[PDB]
Amino acid sequence: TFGYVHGVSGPVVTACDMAGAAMYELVRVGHSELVGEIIRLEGDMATIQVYEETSGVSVGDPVLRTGKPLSVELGPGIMGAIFDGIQRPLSDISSQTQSIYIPRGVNVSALSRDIKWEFIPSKNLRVGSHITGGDIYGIVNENSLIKHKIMLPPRSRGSVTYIAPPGNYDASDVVLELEFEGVKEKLSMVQVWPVRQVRPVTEKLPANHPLLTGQRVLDALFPCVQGGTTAIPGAFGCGKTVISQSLSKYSNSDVIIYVGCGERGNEMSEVLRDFPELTMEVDGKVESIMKRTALVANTSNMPVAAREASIYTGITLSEYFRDMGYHVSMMADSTSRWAEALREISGRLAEMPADSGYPAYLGARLASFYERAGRVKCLGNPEREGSVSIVGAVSPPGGDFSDPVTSATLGIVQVFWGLDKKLAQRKHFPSVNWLISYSKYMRALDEYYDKHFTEFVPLRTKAKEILQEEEDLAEIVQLVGKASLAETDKITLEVAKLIKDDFLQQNGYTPYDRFCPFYKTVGMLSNMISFYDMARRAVETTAQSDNKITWSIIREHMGEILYKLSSMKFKDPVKDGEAKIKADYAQLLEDMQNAFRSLE
Amino acid sequence: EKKEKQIEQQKKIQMSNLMNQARLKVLRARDDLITDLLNEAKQRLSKVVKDTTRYQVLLDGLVLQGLYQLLEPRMIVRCRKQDFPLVKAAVQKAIPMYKIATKKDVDVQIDLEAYLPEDIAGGVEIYNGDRKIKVSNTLESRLDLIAQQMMPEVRGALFGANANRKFLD
Amino acid sequence: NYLSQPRLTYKTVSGVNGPLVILDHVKFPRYAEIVHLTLPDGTKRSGQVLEVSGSKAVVQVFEGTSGIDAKKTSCEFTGDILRTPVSEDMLGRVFNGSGKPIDRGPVVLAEDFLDIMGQPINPQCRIYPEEMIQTGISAIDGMNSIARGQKIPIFSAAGLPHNEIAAQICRQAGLVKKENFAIVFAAMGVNMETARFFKSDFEENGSMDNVCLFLNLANDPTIERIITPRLALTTAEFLAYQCEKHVLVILTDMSSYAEALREVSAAREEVPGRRGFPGYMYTDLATIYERAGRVEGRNGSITQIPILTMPNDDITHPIPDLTGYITEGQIYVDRQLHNRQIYPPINVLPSLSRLMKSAIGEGMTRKDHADVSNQLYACYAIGKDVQAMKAVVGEEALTSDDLLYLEFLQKFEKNFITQGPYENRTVYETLDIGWQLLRIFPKEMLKRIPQSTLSEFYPR
Amino acid sequence: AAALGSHGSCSSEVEKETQEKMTILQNYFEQNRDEVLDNLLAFVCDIRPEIHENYRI
């Protein structure tokens, strides 16, 4: 059955009696069961790229073919797990070995056997029932927040021959058996999928609902859609944690995945230490986010293949959760460090350098990865929708976007939340540079906003214009001083500063800004822009008059409104009811209208 | 004022000049003791080979073990001249076990024309028919090979386990 | 248990090619197996198998192949890869690149053998770096403080005094002292004068009972230069993670190590990657650098400071570039400061310890320290800006505020950065020097420091 | 002079502690060498012949 090692050169192991192998088939090499992928066939001989250090592999050692290409086990026990990029459970490789290392030659199963879970068979089914890929034949109650929907593997189909009754079961139990063309297939709560193959769908849909982060600058000026593709310039000086933590600890996304592409060893342990301590409110309970995630963490020294696979394991886990009818969201901490793993594997394959050193396929690997996002109709019969949102951080050298991974990423992603070291040095958290940043999903949210927030598109448009006008006016302020500007320009600059400091900026450590709902966000901006339009009305309406209104007169006779506008951030969704917040914001609208009427 | 701080380091320097050599003399003593344990072991092996009973059991092992490494159609055993009768018996007991484990025939010779040096503390060398590949199975070679690999067990048993070894990982 | 089976030896040298010797008819060879070559004249040489294929075993000999032949040459195979014999007694001692001692002391009695290649530390088990190591150099400890478990390279350039900084860190380094700490200092491609300097300065200036010193000389054979970093880190892993010791690993010239990966990759006939370095150089430097951090349930901790000669002074070069991607900081040695005879010539502007805010603070050092370092950076930066302004406008055009920043700049280079080769300033002495400079300003000019911290420390 | 006056005392002490450590070694050696040697000698003299496990047949 299995082959034998014939030669080794660095990480590349040639084998013989590999006649029945396939290219990219997964193989165990050596008495220690080292992992590797076939990268050439030469007849009955095959060349295996080994992942771990080959030191001590011997000619004539066993070479067990795995019946699969590189693949992810999917099922119960994903939640709260920490995997590496080739789907090995780092929490269990710790606790089972009692060692601080990943031993060379791990053979621990990725979803831990013998751990029973409460399984409910779908009570609508019977023996002889017809079933297809993506049908939810049962649920596992593995955690209170996330009912794990089991489903028939996408390639499988047939008639139910037996289903397990309600009870406690694990990966070794034959939960389902079905027959097709006279052949029975046995199945388990564990499913397996090729990591480089997309999980198919009934239909990929146009994305049309906001991935609300609870962060004003993001949710208002640069909305990412659920299922959207987006990038963050992940660099130490700009606070990349602020977005990624806020997405996890609040945002409207049923399950989170986080992929360590290849992070610095300490910065990776920072994340793995810190995330378990985060909690989110559900059903008026407080609970650890480890109920709603799995972490695929690779430090820079994990094997080259484990770094380049990292995002493909991540997306595959994320698509499995998408096909349960969840709005999944997935971070990638540095697509640049994944792109280095591409450069290295192509270097070992001796493939020609394309752009700057990277492979020819870097753009295609990025693009065929990002296309795995979106909202979808799931496979199978219960008709559910789900999504995967991809938040791919990039790390351009010196901020230079001409960098191939960064350039191709900005080519493919529809949103860029351009964090900036300048704003972070000024403590302007969330420190998103609104001039550089953009979203291509504005059109796609028109349908949503027209229903729920029909005034908001006007408000967003005015807000960006007001901020852009202040950036142009600042050149005139440098040339000729603030005193030289027109009254309309001065009030625009003052309001743009108010928008910048009391709407874009948000202190996520405070109880009032730890999260910020969308209705709160709209109401705050509505007041600032209603004030702008009425202030500007009084100024322009008193063009050519004997007494002309100016920002200083507005501050003198109604600076209480400016103070109130700045104060609107303090309103608390816990201590204040939604109606109470809306009423206070409506009261500030009435207050400012009467104050403006005292001038014009 | 800086010099008045630095004299505490001059005390540490004089302490180090003394201490760092003193502990090297303790390490030199440690390695001399291990080296003498190997000397006593080599002497004890040179006693063991004088019992033809145990020595036959050794040669029966050492010869067969050499053959089991150098799997070939033709082999040559080299031995000390005076041991040849015991070695011939060992080869004749080993050839059956060679066929049994290897599933292939063999011709084995003892090179009576090319005996090993008499001062070797017993055991054998084995060469293939080409004389291009060899294995050395003298009791001295095994004592070096095994004492080197067992050196942590030797240290831990001989001078006691170090209390700073809180983890074995 | 152990290799109870006897070592084979071959005369089957089927060829010799540059640093390689190709044995043939070999029985079940291992990749990376160690072998002992014997020349025709009986001279022993080590080598390791660099490739295997069927009956062939391509040994790279450690020394050059000078004197090998296809006939009288013989080649013993150990049956095993390179294991270091390791122990706590490797403290107080000096080793060549192969891990043979050279301090006239005896061979190491191993407390255990270890695989030199190590293993990846499990990312669940690595713990965040969270208390400072005192390096004693003020331009590090007051500006770029090192969290124990951080990796932070000293970038430098040819001719700069980075070897004197590396030695000064190796003598001075230790815990903060509000005993159980030991440097492992590993040096590669070292010219014999610089090797004497480390060996002599460490033996003389009090350090040895808390350091292990690995030397690979410039003329030591290039594979021993690849071995040395892994050898040193294997000792650091033993000291930290089995013996609970705190460790600082100092690697003296990662560029001379990159200059070795070139040769070994050429020895495998691999095509050269970006700027002629191996494509996998990122992974290889990661498998060096990430043998570091604290770990769950051990008191032990490995810091690293990789010293790294930027070729042609270029931060874009792969050696500093890849290292900047893998390590949580950088410290820049600067030719501008060295020519001014400022020693140690660390430039505190482009330098950054990314873990500083977790290294330092109340309990870990002193409450003010995290504030003072931000303020010293701001004053040095504004000082440099004003010094450039003076050169444009002339002294009489400077404001009183500018003249303060300029006086601070002058005193900061001549007292904060400047330290000399044997002045072991504690963090506390560095902070007191920080205040001795910052007190030059009016209290209200110190805008990065909190008013409470000023009220508690600005008074003398 | 406080550092300099310590040197002769330290010189005698490192010899005292060397002699004590070497005495402790000699004691441990004389107490343990028999069992250690017997273990090594027994492993030398228990050959356990084996083929290399990669041998196919």
mmCIF file of N, CA and C in Angstrom, chain B residues 78-129:
data_model
loop_
_atom_site.group_PDB
_atom_site.id
_atom_site.type_symbol
_atom_site.label_atom_id
_atom_site.label_comp_id
_atom_site.label_asym_id
_atom_site.label_seq_id
_atom_site.Cartn_x
_atom_site.Cartn_y
_atom_site.Cartn_z
ATOM 1 N N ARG B 78 37.082 -10.090 10.804
ATOM 2 C CA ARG B 78 38.457 -9.974 11.291
ATOM 3 C C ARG B 78 38.438 -10.016 12.802
ATOM 4 N N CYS B 79 39.311 -10.810 13.400
ATOM 5 C CA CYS B 79 39.400 -10.975 14.846
ATOM 6 C C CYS B 79 40.848 -11.113 15.311
ATOM 7 N N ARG B 80 41.088 -11.009 16.614
ATOM 8 C CA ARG B 80 42.370 -11.408 17.205
ATOM 9 C C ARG B 80 42.619 -12.910 17.009
ATOM 10 N N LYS B 81 43.861 -13.306 16.717
ATOM 11 C CA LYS B 81 44.231 -14.693 16.380
ATOM 12 C C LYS B 81 43.766 -15.703 17.428
ATOM 13 N N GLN B 82 44.069 -15.458 18.698
ATOM 14 C CA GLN B 82 43.790 -16.394 19.790
ATOM 15 C C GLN B 82 42.287 -16.625 20.020
ATOM 16 N N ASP B 83 41.430 -15.700 19.592
ATOM 17 C CA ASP B 83 39.979 -15.802 19.768
ATOM 18 C C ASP B 83 39.297 -16.591 18.638
ATOM 19 N N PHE B 84 40.015 -16.874 17.548
ATOM 20 C CA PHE B 84 39.470 -17.459 16.323
ATOM 21 C C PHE B 84 38.532 -18.658 16.535
ATOM 22 N N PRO B 85 38.810 -19.633 17.422
ATOM 23 C CA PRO B 85 37.909 -20.767 17.615
ATOM 24 C C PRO B 85 36.531 -20.340 18.134
ATOM 25 N N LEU B 86 36.503 -19.403 19.086
ATOM 26 C CA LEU B 86 35.259 -18.852 19.617
ATOM 27 C C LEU B 86 34.513 -18.073 18.530
ATOM 28 N N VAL B 87 35.244 -17.286 17.743
ATOM 29 C CA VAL B 87 34.670 -16.523 16.634
ATOM 30 C C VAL B 87 34.098 -17.452 15.569
ATOM 31 N N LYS B 88 34.789 -18.533 15.204
ATOM 32 C CA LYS B 88 34.289 -19.508 14.230
ATOM 33 C C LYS B 88 32.967 -20.102 14.688
ATOM 34 N N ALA B 89 32.875 -20.495 15.955
ATOM 35 C CA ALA B 89 31.611 -20.940 16.520
ATOM 36 C C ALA B 89 30.539 -19.847 16.420
ATOM 37 N N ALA B 90 30.876 -18.603 16.762
ATOM 38 C CA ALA B 90 29.936 -17.498 16.659
ATOM 39 C C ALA B 90 29.427 -17.316 15.227
ATOM 40 N N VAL B 91 30.307 -17.313 14.229
ATOM 41 C CA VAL B 91 29.914 -17.226 12.821
ATOM 42 C C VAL B 91 28.982 -18.377 12.452
ATOM 43 N N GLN B 92 29.310 -19.607 12.841
ATOM 44 C CA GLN B 92 28.478 -20.771 12.533
ATOM 45 C C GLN B 92 27.102 -20.726 13.212
ATOM 46 N N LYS B 93 26.973 -20.094 14.381
ATOM 47 C CA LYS B 93 25.671 -19.854 15.030
ATOM 48 C C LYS B 93 24.935 -18.645 14.451
ATOM 49 N N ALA B 94 25.663 -17.648 13.969
ATOM 50 C CA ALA B 94 25.099 -16.443 13.392
ATOM 51 C C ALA B 94 24.524 -16.673 11.987
ATOM 52 N N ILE B 95 25.197 -17.421 11.110
ATOM 53 C CA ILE B 95 24.735 -17.656 9.729
ATOM 54 C C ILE B 95 23.277 -18.146 9.661
ATOM 55 N N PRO B 96 22.832 -19.121 10.472
ATOM 56 C CA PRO B 96 21.428 -19.511 10.519
ATOM 57 C C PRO B 96 20.506 -18.338 10.856
ATOM 58 N N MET B 97 20.837 -17.572 11.891
ATOM 59 C CA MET B 97 20.051 -16.406 12.284
ATOM 60 C C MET B 97 20.079 -15.294 11.233
ATOM 61 N N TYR B 98 21.151 -15.184 10.452
ATOM 62 C CA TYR B 98 21.213 -14.278 9.318
ATOM 63 C C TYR B 98 20.200 -14.666 8.258
ATOM 64 N N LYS B 99 20.193 -15.933 7.835
ATOM 65 C CA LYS B 99 19.224 -16.433 6.853
ATOM 66 C C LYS B 99 17.798 -16.226 7.351
ATOM 67 N N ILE B 100 17.524 -16.555 8.612
ATOM 68 C CA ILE B 100 16.190 -16.414 9.213
ATOM 69 C C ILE B 100 15.699 -14.964 9.171
ATOM 70 N N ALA B 101 16.509 -13.999 9.603
ATOM 71 C CA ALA B 101 16.071 -12.604 9.648
ATOM 72 C C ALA B 101 16.106 -11.912 8.275
ATOM 73 N N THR B 102 17.122 -12.183 7.457
ATOM 74 C CA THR B 102 17.342 -11.487 6.179
ATOM 75 C C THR B 102 16.623 -12.157 5.007
ATOM 76 N N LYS B 103 16.232 -13.429 5.131
ATOM 77 C CA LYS B 103 15.612 -14.245 4.067
ATOM 78 C C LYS B 103 16.485 -14.474 2.824
ATOM 79 N N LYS B 104 17.801 -14.266 2.921
ATOM 80 C CA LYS B 104 18.767 -14.433 1.821
ATOM 81 C C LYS B 104 20.016 -15.176 2.272
ATOM 82 N N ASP B 105 20.595 -15.966 1.377
ATOM 83 C CA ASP B 105 21.830 -16.716 1.632
ATOM 84 C C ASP B 105 23.041 -15.790 1.814
ATOM 85 N N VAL B 106 24.097 -16.296 2.451
ATOM 86 C CA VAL B 106 25.355 -15.572 2.654
ATOM 87 C C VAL B 106 26.549 -16.518 2.701
ATOM 88 N N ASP B 107 27.706 -16.059 2.235
ATOM 89 C CA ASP B 107 29.002 -16.691 2.481
ATOM 90 C C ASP B 107 29.789 -15.805 3.455
ATOM 91 N N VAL B 108 30.177 -16.348 4.605
ATOM 92 C CA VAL B 108 30.971 -15.633 5.605
ATOM 93 C C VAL B 108 32.276 -16.353 5.834
ATOM 94 N N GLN B 109 33.358 -15.593 5.830
ATOM 95 C CA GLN B 109 34.714 -16.074 6.054
ATOM 96 C C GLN B 109 35.324 -15.360 7.262
ATOM 97 N N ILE B 110 36.256 -15.993 7.965
ATOM 98 C CA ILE B 110 37.102 -15.301 8.943
ATOM 99 C C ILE B 110 38.487 -15.147 8.328
ATOM 100 N N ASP B 111 39.021 -13.928 8.289
ATOM 101 C CA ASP B 111 40.305 -13.674 7.633
ATOM 102 C C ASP B 111 41.484 -14.010 8.546
ATOM 103 N N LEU B 112 41.814 -15.298 8.601
ATOM 104 C CA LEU B 112 42.917 -15.821 9.395
ATOM 105 C C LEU B 112 44.274 -15.217 8.988
ATOM 106 N N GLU B 113 44.407 -14.734 7.750
ATOM 107 C CA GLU B 113 45.628 -14.085 7.264
ATOM 108 C C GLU B 113 45.805 -12.648 7.789
ATOM 109 N N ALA B 114 44.762 -12.022 8.343
ATOM 110 C CA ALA B 114 44.757 -10.600 8.693
ATOM 111 C C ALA B 114 44.150 -10.350 10.081
ATOM 112 N N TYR B 115 44.649 -11.051 11.096
ATOM 113 C CA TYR B 115 44.186 -10.899 12.475
ATOM 114 C C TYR B 115 44.295 -9.455 12.990
ATOM 115 N N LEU B 116 43.389 -9.077 13.892
ATOM 116 C CA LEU B 116 43.393 -7.783 14.572
ATOM 117 C C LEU B 116 44.519 -7.694 15.617
ATOM 118 N N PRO B 117 45.000 -6.485 15.947
ATOM 119 C CA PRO B 117 45.988 -6.263 16.999
ATOM 120 C C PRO B 117 45.638 -6.918 18.339
ATOM 121 N N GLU B 118 46.618 -7.564 18.972
ATOM 122 C CA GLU B 118 46.385 -8.401 20.157
ATOM 123 C C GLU B 118 45.943 -7.633 21.411
ATOM 124 N N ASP B 119 46.297 -6.353 21.511
ATOM 125 C CA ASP B 119 46.019 -5.492 22.663
ATOM 126 C C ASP B 119 44.578 -4.945 22.704
ATOM 127 N N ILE B 120 43.767 -5.150 21.664
ATOM 128 C CA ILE B 120 42.334 -4.827 21.694
ATOM 129 C C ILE B 120 41.631 -5.721 22.724
ATOM 130 N N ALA B 121 40.792 -5.144 23.587
ATOM 131 C CA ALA B 121 40.035 -5.836 24.638
ATOM 132 C C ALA B 121 38.866 -6.691 24.092
ATOM 133 N N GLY B 122 39.117 -7.517 23.079
ATOM 134 C CA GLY B 122 38.155 -8.461 22.519
ATOM 135 C C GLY B 122 37.013 -7.841 21.700
ATOM 136 N N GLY B 123 36.174 -8.704 21.143
ATOM 137 C CA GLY B 123 35.207 -8.351 20.108
ATOM 138 C C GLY B 123 35.804 -8.421 18.704
ATOM 139 N N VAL B 124 35.083 -7.930 17.702
ATOM 140 C CA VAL B 124 35.358 -8.238 16.288
ATOM 141 C C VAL B 124 35.188 -7.026 15.393
ATOM 142 N N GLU B 125 35.755 -7.082 14.198
ATOM 143 C CA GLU B 125 35.428 -6.169 13.111
ATOM 144 C C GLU B 125 34.828 -6.980 11.977
ATOM 145 N N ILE B 126 33.908 -6.394 11.223
ATOM 146 C CA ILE B 126 33.290 -7.069 10.091
ATOM 147 C C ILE B 126 33.379 -6.174 8.864
ATOM 148 N N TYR B 127 33.773 -6.740 7.736
ATOM 149 C CA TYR B 127 33.959 -6.072 6.454
ATOM 150 C C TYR B 127 33.120 -6.787 5.407
ATOM 151 N N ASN B 128 32.645 -6.088 4.389
ATOM 152 C CA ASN B 128 32.023 -6.765 3.262
ATOM 153 C C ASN B 128 33.066 -7.373 2.324
ATOM 154 N N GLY B 129 32.638 -8.219 1.388
ATOM 155 C CA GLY B 129 33.543 -8.928 0.476
ATOM 156 C C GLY B 129 34.469 -8.025 -0.339
#
